[model samples]
Target: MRAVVVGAGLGGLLAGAFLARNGHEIIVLEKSAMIGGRFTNLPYKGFQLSTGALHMIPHGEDGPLAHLLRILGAKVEIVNSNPKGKILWEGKIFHYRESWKFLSKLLAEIRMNKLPKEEIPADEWIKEKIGENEFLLSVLESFAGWADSVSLSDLTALELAKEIRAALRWGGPGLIRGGCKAVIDELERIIMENKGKILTRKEVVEINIEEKKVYTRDNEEYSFDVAISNVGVRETVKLIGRDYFDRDYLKQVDSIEPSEGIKFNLAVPGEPRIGNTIVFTPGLMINGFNEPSALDKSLAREGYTLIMAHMALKNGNVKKAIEKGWEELLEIFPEGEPLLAQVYHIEWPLNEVLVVGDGYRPPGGIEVDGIALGVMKALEKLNLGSFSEWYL
Candidate 1:
């Protein structure tokens, strides 16, 4: 089957990669000059700062993203983090193994339906079960709240108890050898090897579903036996028109609001870098930050460390968020020199402008793991099940 994928984001790339691997003629078009969308790296001042996601993936190499990469024959090396990361609470830092032992077990019981089945906040549920431990409670809030925004899913919500378990099961994230771009470059190679065409700077203007044709803003036309949209469900709905969708479907699509975030990238010269492991600053406006250069020195200039911070953007206040994030970065890394501070967004499934929480994705997914899982779900719908025995 000939397939045309709109947008060359990670989800779109994954979908195209799998379909192309199956010998389906695939053509992926992106509106931007480059692919990978927010998942790719932005080369800046000898530092490999990311467009969005931190260099570290939520679930390690053994998780879904890596599993999917393996199936796609992408040659990217993933080195798992030893302790995953540390949690800062009150005045102490908690290592992953120590703190997560009890938390993981509790989440396990929750997953098994052994815990109280009530519609309550996940943090409150944990507080009830474990009693009042400010450290643990805050960790739940930070981890779930806006702390790990990259996870994409709001795991702490009453409706997403299962996702917490999935996170625990997959364990900590790992760094891609060459950062997120490694995966992107490798995937692009696979597509080219498979004789697939990836077109950038091609803005999709319309989708004539009945005619099975995709119209680009530049007046280019591509027809497909199947059209898989990665430009977000709402955006795709616009391309094809709402008349094609029933009332319920349109309402569901409308309900999906993309969570917004702000990222601050800086370079810290000298020692005292925050290692490859992410530091979870529970109870802060900025939940987490990491020094990607610590894991791979090549990411930054010689003898310089690159650090990136993630924070939730409230009320769409980009300037305020960046300013606040800058203040926090200085407090955390006193010697750091600020580089880029920009607002990033999330989107997905054919109707996928990428949304926050709820169905369409498999239960346990977080971040790229969730992304790969969501794309796989779409693939399964197309009768193109994953080619891996190792499904993440």
Candidate 2:
């Protein structure tokens, strides 16, 4: 079978590879000159910074992403993270791995309050599990709330109960040997090896679905046996026309929501603040270790450590917020803002973008997000079944 994959993002690449492996001829096209899409890396100021996603992947070895890479025969190595990140409690720090033990001690100390998952926030679950006490309560709020950017009472009870269990199965995140670019480059290589073609710098103007073809801005028309769009379902619906799918399909696509985040990358003139990833002062905000050392050693010049921070915000004023946030961030580190070697910010899009892709998983998280898109899209577009099968 002949297949044309639109958008050479991670999802697109995975779909193409799986199809190609099954003896299908695949052609992947990207509007931008570069590939990887949101999962791209930025080579700036001697470091390989990422456009989106931290350098670490949520699930390491037996996880879906790694499993896909293995199946595709891509030689990418992702190193598992150190398990010693400290959780912040009040004005003190405690290792996160020891959180359960701390909670048990707190349980021994006071009366416990148990609430339904529907009634309480996810971050608060850990606190609730901890015995009720002022110190333990403060620790619980900061540790649980800030780490995931969720309020203590917002998460469903199921999510709160299942997350810890999921973490064990999903495994911790691993660092790609060459940063995010390693996975991107390897995926591109696999596509080219399978007689697949990737055309860049060609903006897709329209999807002539009636003719089963793609029309580029340059007026070139490419026909295909089947078309798989890696762009979000909503945008794809717009390009192909709304009538392409039923009201249910459109409504389902519309319901998907994307979370927005701001990332600040800076060069500290001297050593790093913490060796392992640190979960600092939670409940209010999240901050910690995002060094590129696992991937690119040259990310920072000798004697300087590269540092990055990610935070979720409520609004879309990224440019202004980044400036204000930078001011606040510098105060957290010693040596002041003057000691900073370099600084940059990235505001990822929020709303109906990547979120829709996640529905492939019944509920979303590290374990499901990577796997759901991988397996569903790979099987459906490869002609194993209709689009509806991908969802069910």
Candidate 3:
């Protein structure tokens, strides 16, 4: 089948790679000057900062993203995070994958009783079930922020509980050897080798679904049997003209709000004391941070550590929020030399953020893996079996 992938972010690229390998003619269109949407590296003061996502794979090397990459023959190294992650509680740090005792606490609760009857906010449920341990509520809140961008207030108790259950056997939050761009480069290589065309600086302005046509801002037209969009549902509807979809579907699209976040890259002097684990600061203004430079020194200058932090944004004065996040970062790492602070102006967290396009990313779906998951779903719609032994 001939296919057009709208937006060259991680989602578009992944779909293109799979389609290309499956003998489908593929063209990926992007309005930007380069591909990689949000899953790439941005250079500043010689530090390898990701455009967004912190270069952390929520499900790591063994997860869906890696699974798809392996099948596509995209050879990029992804190292499972050591100790996986850490969350701060009451001024002390607790290792996340440290024997599962901490995460097990939630599972223990699940094991002990009936599922939640009402669709209450996760924050409220944590308080009700767990005896008001502000720390636990904050932990779930932080996950909603960092893992899946949403305030704890927005996440339902069932959703939070399901996320916990889903993650029980998950082994991840891995680091790409050269950061996020490594995977992007590898995917590009696969697409190129398979004769796929990726066009940058081409904005897809309209989609004539009936005629199977895509028109660019420059008035260029590309014909395809199927169009897989990396752009979020809202944007996709706009490109297709909202009149095409049923009013109910359009309403659903409007209802699916994006997540919000701020990303920072800090160039701290000397090696990091945080090691390679993701340091999650629950209940703080900032969600979590990690020193990616520790594993890959190339990410930072010789004498410095590259610490990237992520914060979930709320509805308030954004500048003040940025300042508060910066202040908290300094408090966490007093010796840190701040490098870059990026606020994702997105209303909601774009699974793919600017420097990358936001995706129609599902709630609770972790970034690239979520993109990966979305791509597979797209493939299924295209009549290509997803999660195969090989689109190999």
Clashing pairs in 3: 37-356, 38-356, 258-348, 258-349, 259-348, 259-349, 260-349
Taken over the whole model, the C-alpha lDDT of each candidate is 0.73, 0.59, 0.74
Model 1 poorest ten-residue lDDT run: 351-360
Clashing pairs in 2: 117-157, 121-152, 121-153, 146-283
Candidate 1 residue lDDT tens string, 83-133 = 777877665666765775544346667556453567666556666666767
Better-scoring candidate (lDDT), 1 or 3? 3
lDDT of 2 by residue, 1-106 (tens): 7777778777777777766876778888789989887676887766667766566666655466676777789898876656635555555556666656653332
Show the lowest summed lDDT stretch of 10 residues, model 3. 347-356
RMSD of every candidate to native, in Å, equals 3.9, 6.7, 4.8
Model 3 CA lDDT for position 4? 84
Clashes of each: 12, 4, 7
What stretches of model 2 exceed 4 Å from their correct place?
91-93, 101-154, 160-162, 252-257, 276-281, 287-289, 316-324, 336-362, 367-392
lDDT of 3: 0.74
lDDT of 3 by residue, 1-392 (tens): 78788888888888888879988898988899998877899988788888877777887776668888988998887777788778776667877644245333457765444357768998888777765665566676777888766788887887777556545545557777898898889888888888899899999888886778999989999997778777876887788777776767777778866567788788889876777678878878788888787677898888888898888886646789888887987887899877878877132221111111245343334667766765665566445855652211
Question: After superposition, which runs of candidate 1 have C-alpha atoms over 4 Å from their true positions?
Answer: 98-105, 110-116, 146-160, 345-360, 387-392
